[PDB]
Amino acid sequence: ARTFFVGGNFKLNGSKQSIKEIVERLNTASIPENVEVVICPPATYLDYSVSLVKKPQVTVGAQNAYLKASGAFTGENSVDQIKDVGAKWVILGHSERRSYFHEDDKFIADKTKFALGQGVGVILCIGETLEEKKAGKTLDVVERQLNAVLEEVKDWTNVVVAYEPVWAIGTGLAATPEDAQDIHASIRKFLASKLGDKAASELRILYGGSANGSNAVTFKDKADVDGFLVGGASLKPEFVDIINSRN
Amino acid sequence: ARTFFVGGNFKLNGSKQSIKEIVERLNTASIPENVEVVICPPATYLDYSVSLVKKPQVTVGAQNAYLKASGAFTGENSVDQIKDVGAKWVILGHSERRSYFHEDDKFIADKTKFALGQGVGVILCIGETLEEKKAGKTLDVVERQLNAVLEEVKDWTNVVVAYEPVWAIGTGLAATPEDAQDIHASIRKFLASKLGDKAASELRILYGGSANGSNAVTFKDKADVDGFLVGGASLKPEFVDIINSRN
């Protein structure tokens, strides 16, 4: 569902000294023009990055934000500052927030819509636990969580869904191209019956869960895997391998 | 004497221009000496802030950080990155995280801990809810809140305790200078031979809860009221007033 989209969720990792690597390496790079990749760094160097960036494809996003754009919110992230500072995207509902931070669907659902309110890009994170898998329906979970959003967000023109199995986030267990692609159609099917199919045709649904330079090509002709949200190796030089694999 | 500290916590406020006007006015308003201001903007405007301050009597800090300096915690702030960007402080334990973001005594504890580990001070907010208060427990609360740290922190050479009645933050409802002096005083003691007289002596106890230019002067002659955590009032000129009334 068209333009190959590659994200790098640096999580709590970095030095300005080190993101200089990252991003410089990135500016230097032979990557197509028919691409769109965003760098989701720690909230403190989201403007340094912005200033390091010298390649049209790349844009900076954020790891997380609040649902309010200013207030008595000691310790939170404002979409308005992120934009104000350069950034264009914001990751939401990552599994690192849903389990570590008891961030419910609903929060994730106000977050989402608001930010699109403010005109920022939202990379929405969904997935299932080794437990839901084994219980089979995985598709509940992703539809229970993807609904929480639908009630609120009508126009998705801006959302990039990131399908991310909790058992693959940084564990070395990527999901197989075929069950991965399988999950995506469903998603796409899902949303079809709701966002309408010209929408679902343009919606971008990404795969994340131990995507590494090496397994990137393994995915290169799957229809519903229109990208990646790479954490761990978005750090390595091998991040570029991911983007140059044509999927 | 045993040095005046007026902390300005921007909560979810600042623009690169707000932060600067704020920053230059301070850079340019006569309000010296034994005064120490640690201003605290979003993670987002942290590096710019310094850049504009750096550290005469003016130092920067962050409204929150997590308990590990690096890893996979999407969204988090990392002691180590606020250190890198030239930040010296970290508000830890404020009433906002604690209620809405539900971090707890033990959380706060393990983070004040990891926090100084890296040699960054903490601005340990302790405070009582409007019930606490009537059921007369603020001795208890505070003293419990504080125990939970104490049970992980040994050295408090670089801790600054923010005493904030939970009903005085953002309400207008300042604590009367009386009880003001009463409670600070009381815990200088409990704090006393938790860790000795010297420490109890070189250590500050901040008062916060609608602290501002006007009422600021009323704690003038309060030994034990070694300063404040200004939310609201750090966004204006009054900030300057507040650090020109001495102690």
UniProtKB/Swiss-Prot annotation, chains A, B:
Q: What GO biological process terms does the UniProt entry carry, in alphabetical order? A: gluconeogenesis; glyceraldehyde-3-phosphate biosynthetic process; glycerol catabolic process; glycolytic process
Q: Which NCBIfam families match?
A: tim
Which Pfam family, any one, appears in the UniProt record?
A: TIM
Residues bearing Phosphothreonine are 3
Q: Which GO terms describe its molecular function?
A: triose-phosphate isomerase activity
Gene name of the encoded protein: TPI1
Numbered residues of crosslink Glycyl lysine isopeptide (Lys-Gly) (interchain with G-Cter in ubiquitin):
222
Q: Which organism is it from?
A: Saccharomyces cerevisiae (strain ATCC 204508 / S288c)
Official protein name in the record: Triosephosphate isomerase
Query: Which CDD domains does the UniProt record give?
Result: TIM
Its recorded reaction(s) are: D-glyceraldehyde 3-phosphate = dihydroxyacetone phosphate
Q: In which pathway does it act?
A: Carbohydrate biosynthesis; gluconeogenesis; Carbohydrate degradation; glycolysis; D-glyceraldehyde 3-phosphate from glycerone phosphate: step 1/1
